[PDB]
Amino acid sequence: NSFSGYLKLTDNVYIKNADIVEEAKKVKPTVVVNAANVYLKHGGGVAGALNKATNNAMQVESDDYIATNGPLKVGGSCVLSGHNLAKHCLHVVGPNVNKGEDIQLLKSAYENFNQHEVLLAPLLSAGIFGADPIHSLRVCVDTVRTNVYLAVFDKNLYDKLVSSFL
């Protein structure tokens, strides 16, 4: 958990302008969070990037999880191997607000983070699921009570988040 160059936003929430895949490789955190869908199909965005960095081992493992357990619920999670990225990957499903899932489920999604003392994570629902990222950060801050290190790759967004949260 050798996190470097983060800016503390609140007593437990930290942020860096960085690629989560590169952070995971440098730090090999205990837990990296994936922003997943309910069937754990890692076809793009952060999920696609994390899976690619595992050379598809994450996807094969995820398919086996679904074979045993069925799909996750929106706002739910499961813990699988982190392979070369982390000890564990916490796959968390935020709401797909652009397909009508309730934004209030973003609180339930972030509540999964509280099962782990320290996490490297992206913002949830802030890619193609369509939630405003600043809103997603505000829910993170209000909900997570463990120590979360957020990697935000887009500097334009990072600068807006730091401006809004100090």
Coordinates of C-alpha atoms in Angstrom, one line a residue:
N1 CA 0.0 0.0 0.0
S2 CA 2.9 2.5 -1.0
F3 CA 0.7 5.3 -2.2
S4 CA 2.6 8.4 -3.3
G5 CA 1.5 11.8 -4.4
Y6 CA -2.0 11.7 -3.2
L7 CA -3.8 14.8 -1.8
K8 CA -5.9 14.2 1.3
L9 CA -9.4 15.5 0.8
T10 CA -11.0 14.3 4.0
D11 CA -9.7 12.3 7.0
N12 CA -10.1 9.1 4.9
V13 CA -10.3 10.1 1.2
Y14 CA -7.3 10.7 -0.9
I15 CA -6.9 11.6 -4.6
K16 CA -4.3 11.4 -7.3
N17 CA -4.2 12.3 -11.0
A18 CA -3.1 8.8 -12.2
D19 CA -4.0 5.8 -14.1
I20 CA -5.5 3.1 -11.8
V21 CA -3.7 0.3 -13.6
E22 CA -0.3 2.0 -13.3
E23 CA -1.0 2.7 -9.6
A24 CA -1.9 -0.9 -9.0
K25 CA 1.3 -2.1 -10.6
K26 CA 3.4 0.3 -8.5
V27 CA 1.7 -0.2 -5.2
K28 CA 0.3 -3.7 -5.4
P29 CA -2.4 -2.7 -2.9
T30 CA -4.3 -5.2 -0.8
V31 CA -7.5 -4.2 -2.6
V32 CA -8.1 -2.6 -6.0
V33 CA -11.7 -1.7 -6.9
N34 CA -13.3 -2.4 -10.3
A35 CA -16.3 -0.4 -11.5
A36 CA -18.2 -3.4 -12.8
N37 CA -21.5 -4.4 -14.3
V38 CA -23.7 -7.1 -12.8
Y39 CA -22.4 -9.9 -15.1
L40 CA -18.7 -8.9 -14.6
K41 CA -18.2 -8.4 -18.3
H42 CA -15.1 -6.2 -18.4
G43 CA -15.5 -4.8 -21.9
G44 CA -14.3 -1.2 -21.6
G45 CA -13.5 1.7 -19.3
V46 CA -11.7 1.0 -16.0
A47 CA -13.0 -2.6 -16.0
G48 CA -11.6 -3.3 -19.5
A49 CA -8.3 -1.7 -18.5
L50 CA -7.9 -3.7 -15.3
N51 CA -8.8 -6.9 -17.1
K52 CA -6.4 -6.2 -19.9
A53 CA -3.6 -5.7 -17.4
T54 CA -4.3 -9.2 -16.1
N55 CA -4.2 -10.5 -19.7
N56 CA -7.8 -11.7 -19.3
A57 CA -7.3 -13.7 -16.2
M58 CA -9.8 -11.4 -14.4
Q59 CA -12.5 -12.1 -17.1
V60 CA -12.0 -15.9 -16.9
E61 CA -12.3 -15.8 -13.1
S62 CA -15.3 -13.5 -13.3
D63 CA -17.1 -15.8 -15.7
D64 CA -16.6 -18.6 -13.2
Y65 CA -17.9 -16.5 -10.4
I66 CA -21.1 -15.9 -12.4
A67 CA -21.3 -19.6 -13.2
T68 CA -21.5 -20.4 -9.5
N69 CA -23.2 -17.4 -8.0
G70 CA -25.2 -15.6 -10.7
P71 CA -25.1 -11.9 -11.4
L72 CA -24.5 -9.3 -8.7
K73 CA -27.1 -6.8 -7.7
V74 CA -26.8 -3.1 -8.6
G75 CA -25.1 -1.6 -5.6
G76 CA -23.5 -4.9 -4.7
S77 CA -20.0 -6.4 -4.9
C78 CA -17.9 -9.5 -4.8
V79 CA -14.2 -10.1 -3.9
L80 CA -12.1 -12.0 -6.4
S81 CA -8.3 -12.3 -7.0
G82 CA -6.4 -9.2 -7.8
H83 CA -3.9 -11.2 -9.8
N84 CA -0.9 -9.0 -10.6
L85 CA -2.7 -5.8 -9.6
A86 CA -3.5 -6.4 -6.0
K87 CA -4.1 -9.1 -3.5
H88 CA -7.9 -8.8 -4.1
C89 CA -10.2 -7.1 -6.6
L90 CA -13.4 -5.7 -5.2
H91 CA -15.9 -5.7 -8.1
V92 CA -18.5 -3.1 -7.3
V93 CA -21.6 -2.3 -9.4
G94 CA -22.7 1.4 -9.4
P95 CA -26.0 2.3 -10.9
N96 CA -26.3 2.8 -14.6
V97 CA -28.2 6.1 -14.3
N98 CA -28.3 6.6 -18.1
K99 CA -30.4 3.4 -18.2
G100 CA -32.7 4.5 -15.4
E101 CA -31.1 2.9 -12.4
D102 CA -31.5 5.0 -9.3
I103 CA -28.6 7.3 -8.4
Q104 CA -29.3 6.6 -4.7
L105 CA -27.8 3.1 -5.3
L106 CA -24.4 4.9 -5.7
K107 CA -24.4 5.2 -1.8
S108 CA -25.0 1.4 -1.5
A109 CA -22.2 0.8 -4.0
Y110 CA -19.7 2.9 -2.0
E111 CA -20.8 1.1 1.2
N112 CA -19.0 -2.0 -0.1
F113 CA -15.7 -0.1 0.3
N114 CA -16.2 -0.1 4.1
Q115 CA -15.5 -3.9 4.2
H116 CA -11.8 -3.1 3.5
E117 CA -9.4 -0.9 5.5
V118 CA -7.5 0.4 2.5
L119 CA -8.5 0.5 -1.1
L120 CA -7.2 1.8 -4.5
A121 CA -10.3 2.8 -6.4
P122 CA -11.9 4.7 -9.3
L123 CA -15.0 6.8 -9.0
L124 CA -18.1 4.7 -9.4
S125 CA -20.7 5.2 -12.2
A126 CA -18.5 8.0 -13.6
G127 CA -17.8 6.4 -16.9
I128 CA -20.5 5.2 -19.3
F129 CA -23.0 4.7 -16.5
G130 CA -23.4 8.5 -16.7
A131 CA -23.3 9.8 -13.1
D132 CA -21.7 13.2 -12.7
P133 CA -18.2 12.4 -11.3
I134 CA -18.2 15.3 -8.8
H135 CA -21.5 13.9 -7.5
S136 CA -19.9 10.5 -7.3
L137 CA -17.0 11.9 -5.3
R138 CA -19.5 13.6 -3.0
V139 CA -21.2 10.3 -2.3
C140 CA -17.9 8.6 -1.8
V141 CA -16.9 11.3 0.8
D142 CA -20.2 11.0 2.6
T143 CA -20.3 7.1 2.6
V144 CA -16.8 5.7 2.8
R145 CA -15.4 5.4 6.4
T146 CA -12.3 3.4 5.5
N147 CA -9.2 4.7 3.7
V148 CA -9.8 5.1 0.0
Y149 CA -7.1 6.3 -2.5
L150 CA -8.9 7.5 -5.7
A151 CA -7.1 7.5 -9.1
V152 CA -8.5 9.9 -11.5
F153 CA -6.8 9.8 -14.9
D154 CA -8.4 12.8 -16.6
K155 CA -6.5 15.9 -15.4
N156 CA -9.3 18.2 -16.4
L157 CA -11.7 16.3 -14.1
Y158 CA -9.0 15.9 -11.4
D159 CA -8.6 19.7 -11.3
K160 CA -12.3 20.3 -11.0
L161 CA -12.6 17.7 -8.2
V162 CA -9.7 19.3 -6.2
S163 CA -11.2 22.7 -6.7
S164 CA -14.6 21.6 -5.4
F165 CA -13.3 19.5 -2.4
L166 CA -10.0 21.1 -1.4

